[PDB]
Design a binder for this molecule. Structure first.
Ligand SMILES: NC(=O)c1ccc[n+]([C@@H]2O[C@H](COP(=O)([O-])OP(=O)(O)OC[C@H]3O[C@@H](n4cnc5c(N)ncnc54)[C@H](OP(=O)(O)O)[C@@H]3O)[C@@H](O)[C@H]2O)c1
Ligand SMILES: NC(=O)c1ccc[n+]([C@@H]2O[C@H](COP(=O)([O-])OP(=O)(O)OC[C@H]3O[C@@H](n4cnc5c(N)ncnc54)[C@H](OP(=O)(O)O)[C@@H]3O)[C@@H](O)[C@H]2O)c1
Ligand SMILES: NC(=O)c1ccc[n+]([C@@H]2O[C@H](COP(=O)([O-])OP(=O)(O)OC[C@H]3O[C@@H](n4cnc5c(N)ncnc54)[C@H](OP(=O)(O)O)[C@@H]3O)[C@@H](O)[C@H]2O)c1
Ligand SMILES: NC(=O)c1ccc[n+]([C@@H]2O[C@H](COP(=O)([O-])OP(=O)(O)OC[C@H]3O[C@@H](n4cnc5c(N)ncnc54)[C@H](OP(=O)(O)O)[C@@H]3O)[C@@H](O)[C@H]2O)c1
Lengths: 268, 268, 268, 268
């Protein structure tokens, strides 16, 4: 198991990764890809709300990667007050986080301004931005203590090119990008790496969530295109975080070949 | 009184402007400037938390511009549940808003990530982003009914060029920009104008608020420079909103001559 | 004649403006607008290739603004070797330039990459970028000697949001923006103002030139929209350059109300 | 020899890469890295002006990668008239290009506007922009005929964040980005991948060229930092081009850990 070559595996070995939104889509793919690239030799902290999904993943990992160690954690990152204790209370074995993947995130609906539910505004901002920042602040001290660690934030093409009907989501991803940029500028005197991942169309549960479980509307987003799959973004994240320390794959835009922006999507 | 020429005064006359953060700084300057440019002939809705400051402004206006009509409103735009009623309950005379100026906003501290108080995060985001969106959604129906109206959003240079120690503020201003951009893209089939104003250094109460009333630290931000004053930004706002309808001064970055970015500030 | 109010007229009076592309469209509008805003009391240096068009304009100005002084100059700004002498040889009366408007510019064709004529590539880059820089370098010493002066560069929405079929033009306008931004950052220790004007659809001779004189294709670009007219952009330029010296209207995107990007253009 | 894992080697095998600026720095590193990742099993066309440097590289490759096939080409990409014939005249074996790496490029001096030699302006633009576009147009038909191929353009952090003293270079890299973006938007209906690589500080011959051979000034750019080495950027290029076809690593900013922008560079 060395999906990315020997040197990348060496660099990943024995590191501890904390992944938010590990129950599905990119987060889940990323947990698996980290093992593919390191010959199973890492420690994973998988956090999301759906505990069974996490358990199921751990079981999959357990048999596929005997030498992997996985700590499953039911956490709604929206519940601010639980973040700091969550970190402080990690089992000894998993306390020394090396890579934080702020992947948990969502979009709710495609309403034009004027039609947007206040709940949808709070939920998207709280999950995408506020929680991302809380989790970041709670982990950072670990990195600063040892002057090492990667902070990986999931932005989006929507974070640099806004589109109509996506005002809130775009506002949230623009925010994530900016926060990420300040952070990188603050840390230039450390060896802590700050990495922004910005995908276009990836077929996950993202569109299913976005349209409240309506499978029709979800599949329709990808109709007549070959979008990215979660493992494609996972591939990039593991790639970025397995570079030699001095290298920062700082900001990457990943697209399916048929897409060039939110407004430029070829449908065959 | 026609600070911007006859034609601009004609275009402004008898319009109703709603201004958030009218008690100080740019919002206050903007109320005054609208009158300077329209020969007093407008209707102003001035909202902020400090009711006395608003009253004082109204009194100033009352004697300076007898023909102006001013409705003062004590409102904390952060109290979401009060927004919709606020708009619906405007006195008949002021109900027909023509220009919305989403000016109320703030920055809290200059802490590097890791050191940022959760209250400061919520306050900045709620005031700068969430409330701006709520207020925008509450007013927009008025504009859509009559297919006219200007939406003016206070962004910042910080909204397109992030800087260390300003992660939250920058994140919030990037969000305001992106929301604004989505909005403009949604409304291209209307005659509703969407305008983003993005200043650099303006000497107001902004730095005083930012450093919790410490006048030392506040004055220090402007030390050895000649920053913009609030009437400079007011000038631009009134300029943008007094153009003929078909013209959209969509996005303007305004700088004092000694500044070229958050990182490029000459001190004499 | 004070289209922009008294204070703006005072600030413009007796200043010397150098305008490239004065024979048509925005450049021509801008010469006229400067006079509207200053009560005719300025000195204009109008440069372009079509000498009769310039003469015609001067004649118009001569009778409309008796107190204006206009120096007409047949110049192909693409002829680098003539730039420095051009400046150095201005008649005494016009030597002390206060405002440079780098307006001359064009786009040639709408060919996709693979189909682009080399002549069209050189012409667009030489006029839009190289000449702009040459002219800028030649005038700048005047401004540095007296520590004042405005440099106005015509960018475009295309300079920040590229679009298919416009690769060369967009590349050129991105370049103009970047050059402009470096410049502003270099001059923060001077009182020299650096101003970028970025329009969307303006109906001038721009599309006519772009499609090699084919009036059909030209009119077609504006079909079913109400684009900006050249005086709209002139209005903005005169506005920016008539602000008090300390204020820099640094970067303004101006759109007709039906447009929000090169990709978002409503046609009624 | 599979620096990036088996699957990536499979995807690279037997492909033909054309590399500009192969005689040194990133271009040279990239030729080497392609072989490291594919077990020597590719065909390289190495072009630059210094023929001996190319020969030397080929000799290195010949003994290190017996199964590699290398065509060396003395070419000044600035000589436009030679581009099309260059492509058309490639030996049969190397005619079917799969990957174009537009790497040749340079910066000349660090002069502020006003002090910039016209030769330096033409040389930078002709090499970085005009030649890049010419070479792109000449190779593209190959890709369109077979509906596959990667176009890799070397941009820079300078292409999205301009800095004083780098106006021309920045202008040139902004143009490369914009051209690149247009190109990707044009090709969404093909399976041709369009990839922008944007590094910060890499220690190559780049600074040596920039300061006309002065080793002092060159080494000084990197003093007290650990910059990226050419093989770091090579790694990213090979990574991007060895993804499965549907995946486009569209736009990647790569930094040494001590850098976060042109203005944010920590020196230890
Ligand atoms: N997929 C795309 O096309 C797209 C494009 C660009 C960027 N992105 C970004 O990439 C990230 C991952 O998206 P995705 O496509 O993988 O979405 P997804 O398939 O819907 O998964 C999102 C994950 O986040 C978790 N999550 C949501 N809210 C949470 C909360 N309050 N607390 C803890 N965990 C929470 C979910 O698990 P539970 O429900 O079990 O808690 C789920 O596992 C998001 O930030 C998204 O914005 C997505
Ligand atoms: N100063 C700068 O250099 C700078 C630069 C770029 C952009 N801006 C932006 O310009 C806008 C105005 O800033 P400024 O410099 O004029 O600031 P300021 O002088 O401190 O005034 C801000 C106004 O907002 C009001 N406000 C704050 N929170 C409120 C709330 N929760 N509910 C209702 N009103 C509230 C305040 O009034 P009350 O306390 O009475 O409620 C105050 O009148 C902000 O959006 C700011 O981000 C400032
Ligand atoms: N119109 C739009 O939709 C649009 C949008 C954004 C930006 N812009 C920009 O705004 C500026 C002016 O546009 P426009 O609409 O006014 O175009 P226009 O109507 O074609 O006029 C351009 C002017 O430049 C002059 N000119 C062209 N090449 C020249 C050369 N080589 N040497 C000297 N003068 C030259 C032309 O005069 P002669 O032929 O007589 O020399 C003409 O006066 C340009 O930078 C353009 O890129 C236009
Ligand atoms: N180094 C950095 O910090 C950095 C950062 C961002 C982007 N970049 C970009 O990365 C690319 C490579 O730069 P580098 O650091 O590798 O520079 P480098 O070490 O100086 O190499 C540049 C290469 O380009 C070739 N070249 C220059 N002009 C040419 C011409 N007219 N025709 C054919 N070949 C030519 C040179 O070969 P000959 O002299 O033999 O012709 C040399 O092989 C450039 O596009 C650069 O702008 C560099």
């Amino acid at each position: 198991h060395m999906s990315q070559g020997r040197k990348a595996a060496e660099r990943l070995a024995k590191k501890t990764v904390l992944i938010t939104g590990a129950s599905a889509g990119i987060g889940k793919a990323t947990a698996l890809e980290y093992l593919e690239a390191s010959n199973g030799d890492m420690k994973l902290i998988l956090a999301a709300r759906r505990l069974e999904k996490l358990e199921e993943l751990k079981k999959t990992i357990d048999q596929e990667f005997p030498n992997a160690k996985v700590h499953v954690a039911q956490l709604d990152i929206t519940q601010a007050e639980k973040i700091k204790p969550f970190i402080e209370n990690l089992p000894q074995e998993f306390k020394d986080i090396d890579i934080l993947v702020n992947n948990a995130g969502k979009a709710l609906g495609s309403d034009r301004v004027g039609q947007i539910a206040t709940e949808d505004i709070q939920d998207v901002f709280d999950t995408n931005v506020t929680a991302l920042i809380n989790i970041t602040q709670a982990v950072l001290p670990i990195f600063q203590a040892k002057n090492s660690g990667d902070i990986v934030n999931l932005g989006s093409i929507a974070g640099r090119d806004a589109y109509p009907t996506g005002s809130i989501y775009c506002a949230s991803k623009f925010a994530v990008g900016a926060f990420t940029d300040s952070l990188r500028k603050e840390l230039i005197n450390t060896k802590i790496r700050v990495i922004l991942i910005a995908p276009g169309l990836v077929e996950t549960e993202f569109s299913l969530v976005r349209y409240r479980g309506n499978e029709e509307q979800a599949k329709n987003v990808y109709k007549d295109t070959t979008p990215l799959m979660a493992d494609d973004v996972a591939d990039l994240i593991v790639y970025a975080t397995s570079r030699k320390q001095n290298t920062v794959i700082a900001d990457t835009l990943i697209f399916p070949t048929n897409q060039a922006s939110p407004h430029h999507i070829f449908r065959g």
